[PDB]
Each structure stands twice: as C-alpha cells, then as structure tokens.
Amino acid sequence: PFPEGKVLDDMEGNQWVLGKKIGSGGFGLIYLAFPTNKPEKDARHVVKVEYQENGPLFSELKFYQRVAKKDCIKKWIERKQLDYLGIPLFYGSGLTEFKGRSYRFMVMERLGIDLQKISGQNGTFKKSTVLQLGIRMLDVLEYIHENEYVHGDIKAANLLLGYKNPDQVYLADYGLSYRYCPNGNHKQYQENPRKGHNGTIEFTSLDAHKGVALSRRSDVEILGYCMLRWLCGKLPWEQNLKDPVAVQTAKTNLLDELPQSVLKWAPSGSSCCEIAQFLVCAHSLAYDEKPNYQALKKILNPHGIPLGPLDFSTK
Ligand SMILES: CC(C)CCN1c2nc(Nc3cc(F)c(O)c(F)c3)ncc2N(C)C(=O)[C@@H]1C
Numbered sequence: 001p002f003p004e005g006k007v008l009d010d011m012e013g014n015q016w017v018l019g020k021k022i023g024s025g026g027f028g029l030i031y032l033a034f035p036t037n038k039p040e041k042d043a044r045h046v047v048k049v050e051y052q053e054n055g056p057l058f059s060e061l062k063f064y065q066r067v068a069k070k071d072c073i074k075k076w077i078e079r080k081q082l083d084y085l086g087i088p089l090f091y092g093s094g095l096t097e098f099k100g101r102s103y104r105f106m107v108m109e110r111l112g113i114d115l116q117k118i119s120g121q122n123g124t125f126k127k128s129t130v131l132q133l134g135i136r137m138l139d140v141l142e143y144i145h146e147n148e149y150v151h152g153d154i155k156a157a158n159l160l161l162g163y164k165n166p167d168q169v170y171l172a173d174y175g176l177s178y179r180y181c182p183n184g185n186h187k188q189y190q191e192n193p194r195k196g197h198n199g200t201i202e203f204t205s206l207d208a209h210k211g212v213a214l215s216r217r218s219d220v221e222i223l224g225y226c227m228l229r230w231l232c233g234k235l236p237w238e239q240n241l242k243d244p245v246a247v248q249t250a251k252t253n254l255l256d257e258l259p260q261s262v263l264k265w266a267p268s269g270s271s272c273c274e275i276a277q278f279l280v281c282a283h284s285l286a287y288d289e290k291p292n293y294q295a296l297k298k299i300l301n302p303h304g305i306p307l308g309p310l311d312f313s314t315k
Contacts, residue, residue: 001098010092019043026173027055049105056175057104063174064090067147086140086170112161120314122233127270129311130230131300140171141219142293148181150214154222155200167309178214186288187213197244209248217285224279255283
C-alpha cells in the first residue's frame with residue numbers, strides 16, 4: 001500500500017519519498033523517508049502512516065500542532081538552559097491514498113533504537129541510567145504540561161535514543177496524550193468506571209484505573225512505576241496484568257506502604273532510595289497541583305552530578 005519509491009505530498013507542498021518499512025509505532029506503520037529536495041544517503045526522517053479507520057493520529061497531529069513548535073521548543077530550551085528536549089521534530093503531515101481510501105501520515109524525525117532492545121535481563125537498566133531517564137522525562141513532562149497536555153503512556157517501548165546521538169533519549173509517541181487544561185481550565189475531579197483502566201496496565205496511573213480524567217500527577221506517577229520496573233525487573237502486580245482491578249489494588253497497596261514497600265522491593269546492592277522518595281513526592285500531589293519538577297529532579301540526582309552518557313552495558 002506504501003511501496004518503496006512512493007511519493008507523498010504534505011500540506012505545505014513538500015514531497016517525501018518512502019524508503020523501507022522499519023516497523024509499527026503506536027497506531028502507525030513507520031517508513032524511512034527522504035525529501036525530494038537534497039536528500040541525505042541515510043534517511044533522517046520517517047513517515048508515520050495510519051493503517052485503520054479513525055485512529056489516534058489526528059489526536060497526535062493536534063498535539064504536535066499545538067505544543068511541538070520548533071520555535072517554541074528552542075525558546076524553552078534557551079530559557080531553561082537545557083542541552084536538549086526529548087520530543088522528536090515534526091516536519092509535516094497530509095493524506096496518502098490506497099485503493100480509494102485515504103490515510104493520514106506525519107513526517108517525523110528519525111530516531112535510533114528503542115530502549116526495550118538494549119535492556120538487561122527481563123527489561124532492566126542500570127541504576128544510573130534509570131535516574132537519568134527519569135530526569136529527561138521530567139523535562140519533557142514539564143514542557144507538555146505547561147502546554148496543557150498530559151502524556152498518559154510513558155514506557156520503555158515509547159523511549160528511543162537519538163539517531164545520530166546515542167546519549168540522548170526521546171519520548172516518541174503521543175497517541176494517548178490528553179489536553180487536561182484546555183485554555184487554562186483544569187478539569188474537575190470525576191470518576192467514571194466506563195472509561196477506566198486505559199493505558200498500558202502495568203504502568204497506568206491510579207487515576208486512570210478509576211476513570212478519572214488524567215492530570216499532571218498521573219504522568220509523574222507512571223514515570224515512578226516505570227523507574228521501579230527498570231531497576232527491579234518486575235513489579236508486585238506482574239502476575240496480575242489480566243485483572244486491572246487487582247493491579248489497581250496492588251498499586252494502592254504499594255503507595256500506601258511507602259517508602260518501605262519500594263525499599264524492600266529492590267534487589268540487593270541497587271537501592272530504590274531515590275525512587276521511593278520520588279514516589280512519595282508524586283503520591284502527595286493534589287489532583288490539580290502543579291508538580292515540583294525541580295524537586296523531583298533533585299530527588300533523582302541528589303548530588304547534582306552532570307548528566308553524562310547513558311550506560312547500556314547489560315544489553
Ligand atoms: C512510534 C515509536 C514508539 C516507535 C517507532 N520507531 C521509530 N520511530 C522513529 N521516529 C518517529 C516515529 C514516530 F512514530 C513518531 O511519532 C516520532 F515522533 C518519531 N525513528 C526510528 C524508529 N525506529 C528505529 C523504530 O524501531 C520504530 C519503528
């Protein structure tokens with residue numbers, strides 16, 4: 001349906017030539033892509049194409065149009081004095097056709113390998129890497145939250161290294177993202193069972209379990225379960241993933257028994273001291289409360305050591 005050599009036209013008039021299909025990402029097929037004007041030998045762009053009616057690409061497109069502006073991001077980076085922000089570049093979008101049916105596509109920045117492929121036994125990472133990933137994610141979280149959105153699906157499969165830079169990590173899918181504060185108006189707290197248990201069950205927030213519209217605290221919470229999983233190689237609810245209520249109950253039990261619940265869970269020699277503190281910080285937020293990003297980062301980097309290379313020596 002999208003053979004190598006297919007020419008796609010974006011809304012800005014630019015043309016893109018499809019290369020090899022490198023996989024599926026989110027609710028899309030991912031292809032290497034080249035501009036028709038001065039292409040490099042090695043692709044620096046991808047085309048994300050929908051393969052189904054409706055889908056979350058429209059929602060993801062709107063997220064990029066609203067918060068992922070090159071200009072705005074660079075200005076943010078300048079003001080916050082960051083080396084980089086783990087959000088891929090958006091290049092354009094449009095429609096492509098196959099057998100009289102239209103499909104939405106987006107042209108995105110080509111990234112490197114996803115974190116699931118370079119993990120140690122049962123999807124683990126070195127303690128130092130785990131903490132740096134959290135910090136990078138918090139920076140991304142701070143930016144999108146300031147721009148009225150919450151992610152709702154942070155997991156190793158959604159984290160990829162930079163194409164040219166292996167010491168940079170990117171959160172690469174925003175299909176489940178949500179506008180929690182449209183025009184500066186935070187959503188009210190309201191539970192809804194019929195809209196409950198969304199997201200990746202292993203990592204989804206308790207708010208998600210209860211059918212509550214996602215807010216900033218849910219994002220921080222997910223990041224916390226993520227880090228515990230990356231450092232320990234399992235979660236107390238690993239054998240209960242097919243029962244969402246059992247997972248919710250186990251998450252409530254973990255948070256209610258903090259910090260000893262997390263402090264005992266860790267494997268010997270690699271403490272969950274920072275992560276327990278992080279979770280304590282994360283679980284103390286009110287529903288509409290802005291997270292203390294700076295305080296969370298200091299919990300993950302208590303000695304203020306500069307962020308260096310990402311160590312993936314257990315792969
Ligand atoms: C969708 C993710 C979770 C997985 C997609 N993904 C890659 N995506 C990109 N760029 C990309 C793709 C997207 F959909 C984006 O929205 C985006 F902002 C950037 N480069 C390289 C890869 N590589 C090598 C992979 O292994 C897989 C296929």
